[PDB]
RNA sequence: CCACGCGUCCCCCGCGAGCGCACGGGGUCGGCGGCGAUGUCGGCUACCCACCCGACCCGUCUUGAAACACGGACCAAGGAGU
RNA sequence: GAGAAAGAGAGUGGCGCGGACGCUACGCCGCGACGAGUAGGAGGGCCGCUGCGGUGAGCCUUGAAGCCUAGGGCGCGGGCCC
């Protein structure tokens, strides 16, 4: 007769519709949770080292847990030892990037293969421009790009992040499935810098590039991506 | 059965010809003449077919019957259509649909119906 | 009445010292020097006008002896005010040092 | 470059019997069928079982 | 799909963030109404100038 | 039916409205306004009377035939583009016509037409050049204005009535039209000084002259 | 609410709510 | 007005020159035809700056417009005139060539019947 | 302000309709202009020539060949894992 | 195709005759990542030579094989068709 299994679908193509408004108004004020929250972030350590200052002490701020590892030097001519730890790294062709977060065996790690790598302490903003412009994702071990976030929510919804910006979140506050999150995008692959390296083959000290820049990564990756 | 010959004159028939990367079957109710598995006309229970008339007005549509399968006499039938460009198409049309004659290629037949007529009339 | 086109001269192309890429024409317009003097020229077309033997058609008007090969001023090229172009064939190398006009008409003033 | 090395980079296993026998070939055209559009490992196994040679696929007894 | 550039094209930012959308009217709220402020400011010190 | 209202989103910048989705809620007022719940003809024929099909089958098929497209969303036709001036070409304004037959010649805009293109007549009485259209990018402008808000240029004159037809003859509209329009044009600039001999003469590029540093 | 199989009763509930 | 074909696309090719063998130019011994050097010195195998380009895969053209006339068509080799009923049905992408081993006589009836059959042949008027 | 109504028990203080614009799952024009029958249009390639950049002669033994290492004047046919 | 292990499941009570392409399944189609190479190993050749069994109601004195070619072309190439 028909006349009730077209309603019944269309019952369900609009329950299913209803379903999927929920899950924007969701990661809508999810992402206003965010913003609130990085604003209680930015100033409550400015707020901190302004009490320190004026009780005449001092504040060392929190050391930081999250790195940005750029490659620096090509494949050509690498001792084995820093072959292998690039590649746990996963940077393998030049200028690709990585998120790392630090811990006492990831900064040895880092400091073997420190003549090949920059990698610095990025901003909000540092991650936002590698999440939006290049950020893609290991989805099936190919490489899909994120373009909307259903890529995201079926891969990382187990782990209760469904949009970009709860990725974003959970990999600038380095969450509890940061390994997870970290894993699903791709190895960062960046352009040759604009402007141009200093030097590619000494330490960021001695006026280089290579290295430890500390802060100043979020002046080169403006300008590799 | 239709697979088990398909997988036969698959690649060593005699209707087959092969040149310039391309590949065909001159079989005699082949529509779009063309060596696949659903427009190859031997292998199938039923079948459609084609040809322009003997006179040169009309095309004549050949069914291959259901009944008369190892008896190649009594198993094609040719039926003469001499009419109007439109209602010979739509007599190959319901022919093909109201039968439910084998119609993966109705709309084969009638290309190949409407490519016979427009070489059947004369020539500018 | 008179000239409506600026002078340029084809240096040469967009070349390593060891490989040359002849898909762009090296162009030195007359009297701009600089790289805060060049993006005036930046988009506007130009041509290499040329005669040869035996003769073609000229649009609005009758067949004679003139060709052009037309371009385009792509983007600046060092601090000389040096630019860079691509026409729409790759120019010849009894070219090198003969004058390009660059015409004015692409404008976007 | 990419320094990933190419060694095993191709799978060596087959993906249609090397047999030119036509039942064989038509008992895979189904199997394909099944495994690709049921979700039972039995039909998967089963056709790569019968890809296999006859050096894989050993005479099973009756006892 | 190609991807488009999410910085640059809006309304995929807005399709990966919806949120993007009210911080991009109030950002512009707010430097419209800090235009005007600051700009009243200037006006009253070159009328105390003038004064 | 009611007569519609006109956005109330006040466009902020292009694609936000500067009211978000509650004031806008607030402001259309949706909190009282919601709600709850051919090919055949006839024709007698003097027999019996037929039932003529009109948009008949096919009388023929090309043997093959290309699929359709997949469809996308922002190319628009040329008939409904958007169009833009710069900022240095207004009504008033002194152009040098840089392309066409009337290369080099000075003259004076009138109007953005509805295709793009800028009507242009430096009077014939001057300098020979009628009523044209002539596209901005081919033009140099230079900074040179009259005070033309006081003309009334005719509104049956736009691309339809310049656009050309398949010798060409000056018809007799095209001629009165351009006496109507330059005969109030002209007197107007006949009061700024060495301005008729400046539309008399034509731009042209001597030596020691470069147009990055000339300014215009 | 956004989560499926808990959240019928709730999307149904702002369903009826919405007209 | 000739026979146009059903989609017409830009083909592009990515090298119109030839590959002549490295040193084919030199000698007459050794004809144009590519073969692939295998040298332990030779300057051409190991690529250097400025030799004899070699045919790698690259070079392959589109799948789209491979083996594509000018004319927009692909050829179909025609020894005699039941071998266009083949192409009765591929009429607005296979043209006909007719081979050079047939005569005058059936040349004449084959481009009468692909000229009723509407199929567009290359060399219609070869012999005559 | 991604806040909307009514009904009731307790606690603390599941289908509304229509239209339309679109930074929306990869370019369209529902925009145009010229020249063409004995001198012009197109044909990348292939014939000759000009110019810029590149550019050492092959085989082979070699740790290394353009080598002041050996074989090779030029051409046709024969000629080596059966 | 869609963030959520699983049914557009079946039962019992309270006018106009119309709908492109496809699928040589060894076929067609979609995603990503990737491409150096002497010795050597392997796969594919609708690359090529000569002969034999089939087959093309093949071609051929209305001019086959061969050879020549500033002609038209195809293929990355072996080569091939005009
Ligand atoms: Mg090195
Ligand atoms: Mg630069
Ligand atoms: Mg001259
Ligand atoms: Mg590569
Ligand atoms: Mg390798
Ligand atoms: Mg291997
Ligand atoms: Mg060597
Ligand atoms: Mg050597
Ligand atoms: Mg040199
Ligand atoms: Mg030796
Ligand atoms: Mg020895
Ligand atoms: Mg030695
Ligand atoms: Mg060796
Ligand atoms: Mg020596
Ligand atoms: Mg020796
Ligand atoms: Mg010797
Ligand atoms: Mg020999
Ligand atoms: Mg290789």
């Not at chain 3, 010292?17 to 317009?29: D, F, V």
């Given at each position: 007769?028909?006349?009730?299994?077209?309603?019944?679908?269309?019952?369900?193509?609009?329950?299913?519709?209803?379903?999927?408004?929920?899950?924007?108004?969701?990661?809508?004020?999810?992402?206003?949770?965010?913003?609130?929250?990085?604003?209680?972030?930015?100033?409550?350590?400015?707020?901190?080292?302004?009490?320190?200052?004026?009780?005449?002490?001092?504040?060392?701020?929190?050391?930081?847990?999250?790195?940005?590892?750029?490659?620096?030097?090509?494949?050509?001519?690498?001792?084995?030892?820093?072959?292998?730890?690039?590649?746990?790294?996963?940077?393998?062709?030049?200028?690709?990037?990585?998120?790392?977060?630090?811990?006492?065996?990831?900064?040895?790690?880092?400091?073997?293969?420190?003549?090949?790598?920059?990698?610095?302490?990025?901003?909000?903003?540092?991650?936002?421009?590698?999440?939006?412009?290049?950020?893609?994702?290991?989805?099936?071990?190919?490489?899909?790009?994120?373009?909307?976030?259903?890529?995201?929510?079926?891969?990382?919804?187990?782990?209760?992040?469904?949009?970009?910006?709860d990725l974003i979140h959970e990999i600038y506050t380095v969450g509890k499935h940061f390994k997870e999150a970290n894993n699903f995008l791709w190895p960062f692959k960046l352009s040759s810098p604009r402007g141009g390296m200093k030097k590619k083959t000494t330490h960021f000290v001695e006026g280089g590039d290579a290295g430890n820049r500390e802060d100043q990564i979020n002046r080169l990756i403006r300008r590799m991506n | 059965s239709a697979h088990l010959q398909w997988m036969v004159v698959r690649n060593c028939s005699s209707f087959l010809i092969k040149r310039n990367k391309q590949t065909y079957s001159t079989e005699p109710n082949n529509l779009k003449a063309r060596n696949s598995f659903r427009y190859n006309g031997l292998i199938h229970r039923k079948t459609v077919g084609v040809e322009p008339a003997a006179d040169g007005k009309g095309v004549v549509v050949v069914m291959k019957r259901r009944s008369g399968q190892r008896k190649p006499?009594?198993?094609?039938?040719?039926?003469?259509?001499?009419?109007?460009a439109r209602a010979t198409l739509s007599s190959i049309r319901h022919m093909i649909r109201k039968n439910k004659y084998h119609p993966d290629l109705r709309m084969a037949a009638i290309r190949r119906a409407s490519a016979i007529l427009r070489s059947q009339k004369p020539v500018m | 009445?008179?000239?409506?086109?600026?002078?340029?001269?084809?240096?040469?192309?967009?070349?390593?010292?060891?490989?040359?890429?002849?898909?762009?024409?090296?162009?030195?317009?007359?009297?701009?020097?600089?790289?805060?003097?060049?993006?005036?020229?930046?988009?506007?077309?130009?041509?290499?006008?040329?005669?040869?033997?035996?003769?073609?058609?000229?649009?609005?008007?009758?067949?004679?002896?003139?060709?052009?090969?037309?371009?385009?001023?792509?983007?600046?090229?060092?601090?000389?005010?040096?630019?860079?172009?691509?026409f729409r064939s790759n120019l010849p190398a009894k070219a090198i040092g003969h004058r390009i006009r660059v015409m004015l008409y692409p404008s976007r003033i | 470059?990419?320094?990933?090395?190419?060694?095993?980079?191709?799978?060596?296993?087959?993906?249609?019997?090397?047999?030119?026998?036509?039942?064989?070939?038509?008992?895979?055209?189904?199997?394909?069928?099944?495994?690709?559009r049921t979700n039972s490992t039995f039909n998967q196994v089963v056709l790569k079982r019968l890809f296999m040679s006859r050096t894989n696929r050993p005479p099973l007894s009756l006892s | 799909?190609?991807?488009?550039?999410?910085?640059?094209?809006?309304?995929?930012?807005?399709?990966?963030?919806?949120?993007?959308?009210?911080?991009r009217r109030n950002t512009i709220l707010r430097q419209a109404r800090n235009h005007k402020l600051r700009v009243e400011r200037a006006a009253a010190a070159l009328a105390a100038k003038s004064d | 039916k009611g007569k519609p209202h006109c956005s109330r989103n006040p466009v902020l910048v292009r694609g936000i409205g500067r009211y978000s989705r509650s004031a806008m809620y607030s402001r259309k007022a949706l909190y009282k306004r919601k709600?709850?719940?051919?090919?055949?003809?006839?024709?007698?024929?003097?027999?019996?009377?037929?039932?003529?099909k009109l948009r008949k089958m096919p009388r023929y098929y090309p043997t093959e035939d290309v699929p359709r497209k997949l469809l996308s969303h922002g190319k628009k036709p040329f008939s409904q583009h958007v169009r833009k001036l710069r900022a240095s070409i207004?009504?008033?304004?002194?152009?040098?016509?840089?392309?066409?037959?009337?290369?080099?010649?000075?003259?004076?805009?009138?109007?953005?037409?509805?295709?793009?293109?800028?009507?242009?007549?430096?009077?014939?009485?001057?300098?020979?050049?009628?009523?044209?259209?002539?596209?901005?990018?081919?033009?140099?402008?230079?900074?040179?204005?009259?005070?033309?808000?006081?003309?009334?240029?005719?509104?049956?004159?736009?691309?339809?009535?310049?656009?050309?037809?398949?010798?060409?003859?000056?018809?007799?509209?095209?001629?009165?039209?351009?006496?109507?329009?330059?005969?109030?044009?002209?007197?107007?600039?006949?009061?700024?000084?060495?301005?008729?001999?400046?539309?008399?003469?034509?731009?042209?590029?001597?030596?020691?002259?470069?147009?990055?540093?000339?300014?215009? | 609410i956004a989560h499926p199989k808990l959240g019928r009763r709730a999307r149904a509930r702002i369903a009826r709510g919405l007209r | 007005a000739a026979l146009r074909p059903l989609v017409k696309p830009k083909i592009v090719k990515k090298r119109t020159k030839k590959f002549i063998r490295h040193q084919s130019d030199r000698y007459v011994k050794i004809k144009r035809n590519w073969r692939k050097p295998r040298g332990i010195d030779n300057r051409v195998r190991r690529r250097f700056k400025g030799q004899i380009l070699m045919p790698n895969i690259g070079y392959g053209s589109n799948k789209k417009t491979k083996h594509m006339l000018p004319s927009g068509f692909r050829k179909f080799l025609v020894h005699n005139v039941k071998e266009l009923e083949v192409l009765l049905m591929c009429n607005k992408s296979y043209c006909a060539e007719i081979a050079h081993n047939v005569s005058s006589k059936n040349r004449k009836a084959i481009v009468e019947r692909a000229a009723q059959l509407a199929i567009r042949v290359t060399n219609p008027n070869a012999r005559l």
């Open positions: 007769n028909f006349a009730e299994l077209k309603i019944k679908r269309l019952r369900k193509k609009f329950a299913q519709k209803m379903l999927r408004k929920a899950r924007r108004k969701l990661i809508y004020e999810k992402a206003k949770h965010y913003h609130k929250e990085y604003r209680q972030m930015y100033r409550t350590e400015i707020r901190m080292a302004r009490m320190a200052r004026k009780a005449g002490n001092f504040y060392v701020p929190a050391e930081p847990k999250l790195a940005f590892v750029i490659r620096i030097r090509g494949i050509n001519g690498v001792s084995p030892k820093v072959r292998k730890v690039l590649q746990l790294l996963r940077l393998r062709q030049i200028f690709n990037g990585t998120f790392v977060k630090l811990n006492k065996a990831s900064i040895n790690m880092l400091r073997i293969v420190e003549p090949y790598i920059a990698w610095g302490y990025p901003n909000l903003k540092s991650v936002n421009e590698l999440i939006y412009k290049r950020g893609y994702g290991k989805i099936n071990k190919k490489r899909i790009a994120l373009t909307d976030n259903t890529l995201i929510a079926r891969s990382l919804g187990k782990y209760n992040i469904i949009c970009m910006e | 006499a009594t198993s094609y039938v040719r039926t003469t259509i001499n009419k109007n | 009445s008179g000239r409506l086109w600026c002078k340029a001269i084809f240096a040469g192309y967009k070349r390593g010292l060891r490989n040359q890429r002849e898909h762009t024409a090296l162009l030195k317009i007359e009297g701009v020097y600089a790289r805060d003097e060049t993006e005036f020229y930046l988009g506007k077309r130009c041509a290499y006008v040329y005669k040869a033997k035996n003769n073609t058609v000229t649009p609005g008007g009758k067949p004679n002896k003139t060709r052009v090969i037309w371009g385009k001023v792509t983007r600046a090229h060092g601090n000389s005010g040096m630019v860079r172009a691509k | 470059g990419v320094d990933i090395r190419h060694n095993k980079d191709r799978k060596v296993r087959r993906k249609e019997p090397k047999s030119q026998d036509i039942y064989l070939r038509l008992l895979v055209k189904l199997y394909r069928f099944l495994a690709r | 799909v190609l991807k488009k550039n999410p910085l640059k094209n809006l309304r995929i930012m807005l399709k990966l963030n919806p949120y993007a959308k009210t911080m | 709600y709850a719940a051919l090919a055949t003809v006839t024709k007698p024929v003097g027999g019996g009377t037929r039932v003529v207004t009504p008033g304004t002194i152009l040098i016509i840089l392309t066409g037959r009337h290369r080099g010649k000075r003259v004076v805009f009138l109007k953005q037409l509805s295709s793009g293109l800028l009507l242009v007549t430096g009077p014939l009485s001057l300098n020979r050049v009628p009523l044209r259209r002539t596209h901005q990018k081919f033009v140099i402008a230079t900074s040179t204005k009259i005070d033309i808000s006081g003309v009334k240029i005719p509104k049956h004159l736009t691309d339809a009535y310049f656009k050309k037809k398949k010798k060409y003859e000056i018809t007799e509209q095209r001629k009165v039209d351009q006496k109507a329009v330059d005969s109030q044009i002209l007197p107007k600039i006949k009061a700024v000084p060495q301005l008729q001999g400046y539309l008399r003469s034509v731009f042209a590029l001597t030596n020691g002259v470069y147009p990055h540093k000339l300014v215009f | - | -």
